[PDB]
Design a protein around this ligand. Structure first.
Ligand SMILES: CC(C)(C)NC[C@H](O)COc1cccc2c1CC(C#N)=N2
Length: 286
């Protein structure tokens, strides 16, 4: 009866995630003063992580507690699809946030003429569409199924819900859902750092016009940098673990694999906690 304490702790992290993220989606839902562009992208993100803490983590918690899948073959397949989708969405939205920042620094003039709230919403949508095109369909067309015996044994078993995939899909899937979006997000976040240096060097050389709209686009950068940093700190561990497994399945422990996965799962709780930093959000949290 170690199952009772486990159910406890997991219901706690479920609390942190669901409460935090609904708080974010409802705060930006109320204060129009808060409905900035970057805040709307943070909404996309909060909806992904909400889904994680609402389904991905509860159902994934039964499986860890009970050693087996108690919801049958189809719900297994689907639940996996939703985990995958949530991560793909998170990382594509972070990528987009970095790009948005770079533009809203390098071409401030052009930026306010073109980018609006409605264009932000179209963008978030298209992101979720790509996310679901790239993640959701490969699973449902079975492109992920492995030839090996024990694999099929798991497909045949409704209590077997382990993501056992062929190696071409391990590679192409992890590149497309994760490594591409990551790389673009990092290179762009760095080009953004260097712009926000040369700018804060030459703050002297700016009309109280540019020095004030960029004074507003600039603050809330440190937060975004923290968000991105931390995300990388969970999901890169998991995905590297995942790519080594293709070279040699005996090189990674099965519980390390489960650990680094629950690392990235916990990331969906960290984001709300990282918002307690900003006085704009901190006051809105009380
Ligand atoms: C318990 C499970 C395993 C269901 N959780 C999935 C994991 O959190 C995220 O896994 C992935 C996300 C995006 C792209 C991926 C991926 C695994 C592979 C492979 N080959 N390509």
């Amino acid at each position: 009866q170690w199952e009772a304490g486990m159910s406890l702790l997991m219901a706690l992290v479920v609390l942190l995630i669901v409460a935090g993220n609904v708080l974010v989606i409802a705060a930006i839902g109320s204060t129009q003063r808060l409905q900035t562009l970057t805040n709307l992208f943070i909404t996309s993100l909060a909806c992904a992580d909400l889904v994680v803490g609402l389904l991905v983590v509860p159902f994934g918690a039964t499986l860890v507690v009970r050693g087996t899948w108690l919801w049958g073959s189809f719900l297994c397949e689907l639940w996996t699809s939703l985990d995958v989708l949530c991560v793909t969405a998170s990382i594509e939205t972070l990528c987009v946030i970095a790009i948005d920042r770079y533009l809203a620094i390098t071409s401030p003039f052009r930026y306010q003429s073109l980018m609006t709230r409605a264009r932000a919403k179209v963008i978030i949508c298209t992101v979720w569409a790509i996310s679901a095109l790239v993640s959701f369909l490969p699973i449902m067309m079975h492109w992920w199924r492995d030839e090996d015996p024990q694999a099929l044994k798991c497909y045949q078993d409704p209590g077997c819900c382990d993501f056992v995939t062929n190696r071409a899909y391990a590679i192409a899937s992890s590149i497309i859902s994760f490594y591409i979006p990551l790389l673009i997000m990092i290179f762009v976040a760095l080009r953004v750092y260097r712009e926000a240096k040369e700018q804060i060097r030459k703050i002297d050389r700016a009309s109280k016009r540019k020095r004030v709209m960029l004074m507003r686009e600039h603050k809330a950068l440190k937060t975004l940098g923290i968000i991105m940093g931390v995300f990388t700190l969970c999901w890169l561990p998991f995905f590297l673990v995942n790519i080594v497994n293709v070279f040699n399945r005996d090189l990674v422990p099965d519980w390390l694999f489960v650990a680094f996965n629950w690392l990235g799962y916990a990331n969906s709780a960290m984001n709300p906690i990282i918002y307690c930093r900003s006085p704009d959000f901190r006051k809105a949290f009380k």
